[PDB]
């Protein structure tokens, strides 16, 4: 009979960058 | 006998996005 | 002698990404 199952790939990759945050208070 | 264990798993999903950045400095 | 085992299951997902930029300018 076939073996058994292999174990779970690796993580996968990073995921992408946030947003650029809030502007900055009026002068 | 059983056969050998399979190969590893493919990679998993990318993760999330990151948290925003920041905000930007005063005007 | 047997087969292999398929293939195992997708992994954990990445971590998080880096954080976003400062915003602009006020």
Same mark, same amino acid.
């Given at each position: =009979?076939? $073996? =058994? *199952? &292999? %174990?779970?790939? *690796? %993580? $996968? %990759?990073?995921?992408? =960058? &946030? *947003? +650029?945050? +809030? =502007?900055?208070?009026? &002068?």
């Amino acid at each position: =009979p076939p $073996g =058994p *199952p &292999g %174990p779970p790939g *690796p %993580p $996968g %990759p990073s995921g992408p =960058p &946030g *947003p +650029p945050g +809030p =502007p900055g208070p009026p &002068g």
